[PDB]
Design a protein around this ligand. Structure first.
Ligand SMILES: NC(=O)C1=CN([C@@H]2O[C@H](COP(=O)(O)OP(=O)(O)OC[C@H]3O[C@@H](n4cnc5c(N)ncnc54)[C@H](OP(=O)(O)O)[C@@H]3O)[C@@H](O)[C@H]2O)C=CC1
Ligand SMILES: NC(=O)C1=CN([C@@H]2O[C@H](COP(=O)(O)OP(=O)(O)OC[C@H]3O[C@@H](n4cnc5c(N)ncnc54)[C@H](OP(=O)(O)O)[C@@H]3O)[C@@H](O)[C@H]2O)C=CC1
Ligand SMILES: O=CN(O)CCCP(=O)(O)O
Ligand SMILES: O=CN(O)CCCP(=O)(O)O
Lengths: 398, 398
């Protein structure tokens, strides 16, 4: 049996992860749950799975949680704060850490798991994007194995040969017959929206993905295709790919999750229902397999699968992220930090949908800072670009 | 470097194979070529690649070949007949044998390669279909590794995990997380032809595949979907799959070549241009990769990819083959033998297109014979069902 600490257990991926455990009691046991403010969800999960520990990031939420748990007679002890999260990710009995906190806030707890040599089920993409080579150095230095959870990177992982799978980010693609990595695809809920209508799209409209049920941040990133930009940066670190070995493709139907080109013409791909339990269960069981709760993909009830090239006028964010990689880690760290702030601003109805890409570009220009040489510098650049992002948000606020 | 005997070098797959060699002189060398009657093609290939030996099955064709070769000053020695083919497939210097003769005639030379412990690049599907468990017993008994060349079985092979790849036909699918094998797909050139028009389709119309350039036999089998029936039988032996672990799906566009379901919902698939150099080059280089001459599949210039369930009224042959597997090896051997005769009859304009499935059914009923216990019995059943098939052909001939 394998034992998990789940970071961000109350989110969409954390809930999908717990459902995989729920469908496989004899293979998986949850030792610790870690979240932020969602008390009702955490108390559902603590009473159900009886974890040893439960962390809420915010102190007042931990108090409410302990009151309900101690009333029912639960054995789950409640802690709080960032360091508690880091300690839960480094427990001796833990075999796997589902890194599924949203944004760069999940960096430090995820790095604690990596320093303790845990198997990292990596979903929290903003952490790798913002930390870059320093994240990959930390994994190599320790005894830790990265298993990508993100639909796209998991699909690519499953379509890569074993020398790559067993030396992720350090193996050579060309030596193993890989020409490029094909990153798909959805294109968001405003794919077919007229360009001049994009600015009037509300948060509720941006969070209604046709195929995916996700958190709010990641759903807005799907709409702007900043998600694909962040996954592009991430894929280059995860799979040791250069700009010329990367491709980006819109696939509206979200059936194909991503692909890998090979020298002989072959393209290996992962397919299935647009449902995160599948890739989550891939990593939890790898190199074996388990049932995830997802039913078999019925090919006779599908929409015709199409592909199209991404239009940078429709998706200014994609361009921002792809060029931020060429600009370096300071700009990338600054971009991700800015995108976190502007997406939050958009959801709070402070700015318009298309203001996300305008203000993101603005923050990047106003940032002038040295390339991070350590994790502290990564957080200093992140903190400083958030300050700038907030100022710009208020420059477009009613 | 690796050295090949190519069986059926002058056919469509043999030509595709030689083009892979042509694109990789430093990785591949042809020691021997083996064909039937196509003298102009064999003399092209002997003068180009300067093989040690060249076999033509028919004696008069070997004479014509030797005349031209000895005039130019070629070092290639010409032999003839079936035993010569078997000896070429068992030469000490040979590393790989491309089994690409059409029909059951390729059985014995392919079995010679298997007894000599060669790496079998298996394209000749009628040999495995007609020989069944006895073919798989011969491979296990020897030091031989099967690498499927057929578009579909190669795609499946590339989408299966390594324990299956390294113990093909003897490994357990369920233990390795495989739920089913998804076999696609094209549906032939008469897919959208009205049912009542099928009987007036000419040989020339049946050999015009939208996506594939193949030999005539295999193209008619695509039109009746007997090809998919033969690949269904073959897939069950190659990958140790039961009826419930097999699926059949029409995919008109021929972009996806076949897929594999997994327990967690995952479906791994191979994609690419409909071009046999790709899967051929997969096997020749495996587990490495080489260039095959096939360009990268442009996803932005594709037709929408559709899938549909096969209709047995449109494709009576598919039903015949799937049920012939339940009926045993004698019926399967008899069916394949009958289909060889009727497809030949159709191409020679002796019977109509839809007469293929009628006469195939007829032969099966009139056959009453014991299950083969050895290779000799397989050939006795094959020989006897050809006799019957010929009689039935003349019962519908003008
Ligand atoms: N959902 C999906 O289909 C996919 C998500 N991802 C990525 O995975 C990550 C998770 O996304 P998703 O689950 O959708 O986001 P959600 O908004 O649904 O949930 C995020 C989780 O993180 C927790 N969290 C936030 N801040 C902290 C903190 N500082 N300390 C500890 N926990 C915190 C939240 O707790 P709480 O809610 O209690 O406040 C919540 O449980 C993201 O980085 C996303 O980009 C990648 C591919 C797919
Ligand atoms: N073409 C394709 O895309 C695919 C083919 N296959 C299978 O692979 C095999 C090859 O098919 P394909 O190349 O299309 O067929 P072709 O008709 O194009 O060629 C068949 C080859 O076999 C040779 N041959 C026939 N009889 C004998 C004999 N008795 N002794 C030695 N050689 C002989 C022919 O020689 P000659 O022409 O000189 O008489 C020819 O070179 C078939 O079993 C087919 O089902 C499977 C998947 C795809
Ligand atoms: O894992 C899932 N994602 O990454 C979100 C996919 C939606 P997109 O393809 O529009 O980014
Ligand atoms: O390798 C190629 N084939 O098997 C022929 C494919 C055409 P079909 O899918 O119609 O059988």
């Amino acid at each position: 049996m394998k034992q998990l600490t789940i970071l961000g257990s109350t989110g969409s991926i954390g809930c999908s992860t717990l459902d995989v455990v729920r469908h496989n009691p004899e293979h998986f046991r949850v030792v610790a749950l870690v979240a932020g403010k969602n008390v009702t969800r955490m108390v559902e999960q603590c009473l159900e799975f009886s974890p040893r520990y439960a962390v809420m990031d915010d102190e007042a939420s931990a108090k409410l949680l302990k009151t309900m748990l101690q009333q029912q007679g639960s054995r789950t002890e409640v802690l709080s704060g960032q360091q508690a999260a880091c300690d839960m990710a480094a427990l001796e009995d833990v075999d796997q850490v589902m890194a599924a906190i949203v944004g760069a806030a999940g960096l430090l707890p995820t790095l604690a798991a990596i320093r303790a040599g845990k198997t990292i089920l990596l979903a929290n993409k903003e952490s790798l994007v913002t930390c870059g080579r320093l994240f990959m150095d930390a994994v190599k230095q320790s005894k830790a194995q990265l298993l990508p959870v993100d639909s796209e990177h998991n699909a690519i992982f499953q379509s890569l040969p074993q020398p790559i799978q067993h030396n992720l980010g350090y193996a050579d693609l060309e030596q193993n017959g890989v020409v490029s990595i094909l990153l798909t695809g959805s294109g968001g809920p405003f794919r077919e929206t007229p360009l001049r209508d994009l600015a009037t799209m509300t948060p509720d409209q941006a969070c209604r993905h046709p195929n995916w049920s996700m958190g709010r941040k990641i759903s807005v990133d799907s709409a702007t295709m900043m998600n694909k930009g962040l996954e592009y940066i991430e894929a280059r670190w995860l799979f040791n790919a250069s700009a010329s070995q990367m491709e980006v493709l819109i696939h509206p139907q979200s059936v194909i999750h991503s692909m890998v080109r090979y020298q002989d013409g072959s393209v290996l791909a992962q397919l299935g229902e647009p449902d995160m339990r599948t890739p989550i269960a891939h990593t939890m069981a790898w190199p074996n397999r388990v049932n995830s709760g997802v039913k078999p993909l019925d090919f006779c009830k599908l929409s015709a699968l199409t592909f199209a090239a991404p239009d940078y006028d429709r998706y200014p964010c994609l361009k921002l992220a792809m060029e931020a990689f060429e600009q370096g880690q300071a700009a990338t760290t600054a971009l991700n930090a800015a995108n976190e702030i502007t997406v939050a601003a958009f959801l709070a109805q402070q700015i318009r949908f298309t203001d996300i890409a305008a203000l993101n570009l603005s923050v990047l220009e106003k940032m002038d800072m040295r390339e991070p040489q350590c994790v502290d510098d990564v957080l200093s650049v992140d903190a400083n670009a958030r300050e700038v992002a907030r100022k710009e948000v208020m420059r477009l606020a009613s």
